[PDB]
Amino acid sequence: DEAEASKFVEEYDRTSQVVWNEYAGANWNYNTNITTETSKILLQKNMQIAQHTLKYGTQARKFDVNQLQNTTIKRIIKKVQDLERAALPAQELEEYNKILLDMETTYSVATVCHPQGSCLQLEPDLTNVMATSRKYEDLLWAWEGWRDKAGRAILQFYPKYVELINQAARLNGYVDAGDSWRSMYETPSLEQDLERLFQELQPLYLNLHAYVRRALHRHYGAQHINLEGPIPAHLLGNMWAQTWSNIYDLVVPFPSAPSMDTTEAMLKQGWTPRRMFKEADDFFTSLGLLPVPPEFWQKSMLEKPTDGREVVCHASAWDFYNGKDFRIKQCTTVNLEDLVVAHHEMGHIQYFMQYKDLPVALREGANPGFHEAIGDVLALSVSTPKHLHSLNLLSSSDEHDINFLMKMALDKIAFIPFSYLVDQWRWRVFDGSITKENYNQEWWSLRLKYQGLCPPVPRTQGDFDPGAKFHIPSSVPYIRYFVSFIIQFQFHEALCQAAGHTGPLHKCDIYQSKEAGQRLATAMKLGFSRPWPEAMQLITGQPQMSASAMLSYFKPLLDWLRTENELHGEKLGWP
Ligand SMILES: *[C@@H]1O[C@H](CO[C@@H]2O[C@@H](C)[C@@H](O)[C@@H](O)[C@@H]2O)[C@@H](O[C@@H]2O[C@H](CO)[C@@H](O[C@@H]3O[C@H](CO)[C@@H](O)[C@H](O[C@H]4O[C@H](CO)[C@@H](O)[C@H](O)[C@@H]4O)[C@@H]3O)[C@H](O)[C@H]2NC(C)=O)[C@H](O)[C@H]1NC(C)=O
Ligand SMILES: O=C(O)[C@@H]1C[C@@H](C2CCCCC2)CN1C(=O)CP(=O)(O)CCCCc1ccccc1
Ligand SMILES: *[C@@H]1O[C@H](CO)[C@@H](O)[C@H](O)[C@H]1NC(C)=O
Ligand SMILES: [Cl-]
Ligand SMILES: [Cl-]
Ligand SMILES: [Zn+2]
């Protein structure tokens, strides 16, 4: 019994490395060169990997996991018993794969055209418009156009996608696809735990929302901002209003402190996409963590091709399951926002390298939120005025202090409600609570309820605004990013204490701390081999998710915001 199970996992591991490596190659080749040919190859490799999953998953299910003694083997076999989409009958699997390909392609090639003019792609063009334009009608054209062309075009696929991903989930023992996604956390109390974390961030978010709302009132006019209502969703500097720091110029707490134009500084100093990833690589090795291999620099796609290729620009980090080949695919722009994204992606890469010697079934983060958080942790230190000054991107007070926390909060605090609601919506689609009759109406009920946002143009039949957000057509879970924003502050607090930092948490910069790197390395090397509380305990000395670190980080800003909003008589929220 035990020996057959040991031999099975050994055979599964050596055969999976080969099949997954070939699939990743074809998937990469399509993502970096969308053509009829690369798609057909990709759909073909999808059947090869499905055949492999079906063979070994079927055998995995013949083992009584209850009777297995070794806990590691037990854990691998139980995981291999989930065939995912390979549980579907051949017809449904082919349909599902084609639906996923059509949805992701549709999103990644959509364009928005000026009337009788040029057509803009999401990256860099529409992203830049949302970030820099300060004109209501210009932002409205981009915001509505992107949903008309990306969102509406996904709607025809989504009901069948839901049917098929749910059918696969049920064939693997779950009640629907959202049940299966939540199980990735191995936490029966996940929904309650996440809800309590969200509620703990309400004071900060409501106060930030009211303050930003007041500033938008000042710039966009009293006829267009209701000081007791939700904020129009196109005015926050980002296509999904998920992060707000691109409107920092409109909301500066102390404008007497002049802001240095960081984008012009990077450009003026010759920064390139390569330089940005090199700086991130240097931060990782400064902690004693691993450098990316030479292969990474030869094979990655660090900027948008200029040779006619159509590509998937949305940033992602790729493990090719051979322990040597790791790559980033990002249409990088030279600015601070994408430097932070670059660090985010390099954290994925770091995780891949740290757990590369585990069995492939355990080459995942402790939970998906851990995988999303690593790069963000370092980026917190990178974003400090001290570190940015050392990169010659800033010029060397309480005013500057509150200014910096506001910049951070526009990204870290504003993202909390957005990242919470995406899968609140999808979980209820998957469990049948939301039908295609009210996809979009229920999306905006959550946009209002959690983010306090409203659409600038009333939605109509045919709209499918969730389809205008990458992770929806690409079928990538989102609660991981909510978890990441909570725990990345817990990790920051812990590493800063390990590094000997005293004083306000937001002044910590862990650059070159070997003590901090070692905490992270010991956790990352566990991969998915243990329940995630153990990785949490290795980093922080305790096992729970907690918002206390994030609240401690932003405490000075919470006090400043309350005083400011009180002074102006704001009514928090949106009744
Ligand atoms: C339950 O099973 C797991 C997994 O076993 C592994 O997979 C099976 C399918 C089968 O192939 C097994 O043969 C195979 O080991 C066990 O977990 C493994 O435990 C061993 C314990 O030694 C670990 O071995 C380590 O491997 C490292 C990389 O090669 C190596 O560096 C380590 O050396 C360290 O210690 C020596 C001591 O002399 C020191 O000299 C070194 O400098 C270094 O510190 C060590 O040899 C495996 O990595 C583990 N693999 C996994 C996946 O966890 C587990 O022990 C078992 N449980 C029970 C109760 O039997
Ligand atoms: O864009 C978003 O919405 C979120 C939030 C953003 C984060 C970055 C730093 C600053 C704060 C926000 C990062 N991100 C991403 O999707 C980037 P990924 O690599 O996780 C996207 C991964 C998609 C799945 C995948 C995996 C491997 C290969 C191909 C596809
Ligand atoms: C893109 O794919 C086509 C067809 O597979 C191929 O001929 C072409 O060389 C590829 N381009 C690049 C830059 O790899
Ligand atoms: Cl939207
Ligand atoms: Cl997740
Ligand atoms: Zn990520």
Nearest ligand to the CA atom of 480: 5
Q: Is 485 helix (H, G, I), strand (E, B) or coil?
A: helix
Q: What is the CA radius of gyration of the chain?
A: 24
> Is 371 marked as binding a ligand?
no
Q: Whose CA is closest to 287, among 392, 408, 375? A: 375
Question: Which ligand 3 atom is at minimum distance from the Cα of 307?
Answer: 13
Tell me the one-letter amino acid at 541. Answer: G
Which residue, chain included where needed, has tokens 């990709």? 42
Q: Report residue 312: phi and psi, to 5°.
A: -85, 105
Partners of 316 in beta bridges: 329
Checking 563-566 for CB contacts under 8 A at 24+ apart, the result is 564/211, 564/253, 565/207, 565/210, 565/211, 565/214
User: What residues sit around ligand 5, an ion, with C-beta below 5 angstroms?
Assistant: 368, 477, 479-480
Taken in order 464, 422, 27, 167, the sign of the CA dihedral is: negative
Q: Check residue 292 and report its DSSP letter.
A: P
Give the pair of three-digit tokens for residue 401: 């202090």
At 76, list the tokens.
């691998």
Burial environment of residue 245 by CB neighbours within 10 A (0 to 12, 13 to 18, 19 or more)? buried
Name which residue sits closest to atom 11 of ligand 3, judged by CA: 33
Q: Which residue, among 466, 200, 243, 235, has the nearest Cα to 344 in the 3D structure? A: 243
- Among left, alpha and beta (phi > 0; psi -120 to 50; other), residue 541 is left
**Which residues are CB-neighbours of 486 under 8 A, at least 6 positions away?**
197, 369, 545, 546, 547, 550
Active site annotation includes 345: yes
Q: Would you call 319 helix, strand, or coil by DSSP?
A: strand
Greatest alpha-carbon span in the chain: 74
Token pair 């306000």 is found at: 504
Q: Ligand 1 atom 47: the closest Cα is on which residue?
A: 358
Q: What is the DSSP letter of 222?
A: T
H or E stretch covering 121: strand 119-121
Q: Angle between the 202-220 and 398-412 helix axes, to the nearest 10 degrees?
A: 100
Residue in 551, 553, 533 with CA at minimum distance from that of residue 193: 533
Query: CA 413 to CA 23: how far, in whole Å?
Result: 37
- For residue 240, say whether it is annotated as part of any ligand binding site: no
Residue 193: Cβ-neighbour burial (10 angstroms; 0-12, 13-18, 19+): middle
Distance CA 327, CA 273 (A): 14
Q: Which of 337, 345, 442, 493 is catalytic?
A: 345
Q: Which long-range contacts (CB under 8 A, 24 or more apart) does 564-572 make?
A: 564/211, 564/253, 565/207, 565/210, 565/211, 565/214, 568/214, 570/210, 570/211, 570/213, 570/214, 570/227, 571/210, 571/227, 571/228, 572/206, 572/207, 572/209, 572/210
Candidates 219, 471, 515, 564; catalytic one? 471
Peptide bond into 124 cis (omega under 30): yes
What is the whole-number distance in angstroms between the Cα of residue 42 and the centre of ligand 6? 23
Instruction: Judge whether 372 is annotated as a binding position.
Output: yes
Distance 329 CA to ligand 3 centre (A): 16
Q: Identify the residue whose C-alpha is closest to ligand 3 atom 7.
A: 37
CA 459 to ligand 5 center in whole angstroms: 29
| Tokens of residue 50, six digits | 């499905």
Residue 144 annotated in active site:
no
73 lines ligand 1 (CB under 6 A): yes
Ligand-binding annotation for 234, yes or no, is no
- Buried-exposed string 351-386: b where 16+ CB fall within 10 A, e elsewhere: bbbbbbebbbbbbbbbbbbbbbbbbbbbbbbbbbbe
Q: Ligand 4 centroid vs 487 CA: distance in angstroms?
A: 26
CA 106, 108, 113, 117 torsion-angle sign: negative
23 labelled ligand-binding:
no
* Cα dihedral 239→242→243→249 (10° resolution): 50
Cβ < 6 Å from ligand 3: which residues?
33, 35, 37-38, 309
> Is 170 known as a binding-site position?
no
> Which tokens in the block code for residue 262?
């960081």
CB 93 within 8 A of CB 100: no
DSSP 230: P
* Alpha-carbon torsion (105, 109, 112, 117), positive or negative: negative
The CA distance from 216 to 237, in Å, is: 11
Q: Give the Cα separation of 273 and 328 in Å (integer).
A: 12
Give Cβ neighbours of residue 483 (< 8 Å, ≥ 6 apart): 185, 194, 367, 368, 369, 372, 373, 545
CB-based burial, 311-326: b 16+ in 10 Å, e otherwise: bbbbbbbbbbbebebb
- Where helices occur in 221-300 by DSSP H, the ranges are 248-251, 262-268, 273-286, 294-299
Classified as helix, coil or strand, 425 is helix
Residue of the CA atom closest to atom 12 of ligand 3: 33
Handedness of CA 301, 307, 309, 314 (dihedral sign): positive
Residues in the chain: 575
- What are residue 537's phi and psi, to 5 degrees? -70, -35
User: Which of 8, 13, 70 is the best mutation target for the ligand 1 pocket, counting ligand atoms within 8 Å of the beta carbon and taking the most?
Assistant: 70
Cα(62) to ligand 1 centroid in Å equals 26
For strand 453-454 and strand 231-232, is the pairing parallel, antiparallel, or unpaired? Answer: parallel
33, 59, 87, 136 from 81: Cα distances, Å: 34, 8, 10, 52
Q: Which helix (H) or strand (E) holds 556?
A: helix 548-568
Burial class of residue 227 in the structure, from the number of CB atoms within 10 Å of its CB (0-12 exposed, 13-18 middle, 19+ buried):
middle
Q: List all residues 6 or more positions away from 233 whose beta carbon is below 8 Å from its beta carbon.
A: 143, 241, 447, 453, 454, 455, 456
Tell me the ligand closest to 41's alpha carbon.
3
Cβ-contact 476, 492 below 8 angstroms = no
Per DSSP (E only), the strands in 393-494 are: 453-454
CA–chain centroid gap for 306, Å, is 26
147 is in an annotated binding site: yes
Amino acid sitting at position 40: K
For ligand 3, the distance from its centroid to the CA atom of residue 294, given in whole angstroms, is 23
Read off the tokens for 300. 């990655």
Resolution reading in Å: 1.9
Contact 505, 553 (CB under 8 A): yes
CA-based angle 278:279:284, to the nearest 5? Answer: 95
Buried b (16+ CB within 10 A) or exposed e, 28-54: bbbbbbbeeebbeebbebbeebbebbe
Question: Which segments of 71-189 does DSSP mark as H helices, in order?
Answer: 71-80, 90-109, 127-132, 136-146, 152-154, 158-171, 177-182
Using the mean position of ligand 4's atoms as its centre, give its distance from the Cα of residue 443 in Å.
8
Q: How far apart are CA 448 and CA 451, in angstroms?
A: 6
Residue nearest to atom 16 of ligand 2 (CA): 315
Q: Is the shortest distance between the CB of 351 and ligand 2 below 6 Å? A: no
Who's near 150: CB < 8 A, 6+ residues apart?
106, 107, 110, 122, 467, 468
CB 468 within 8 A of CB 497: no
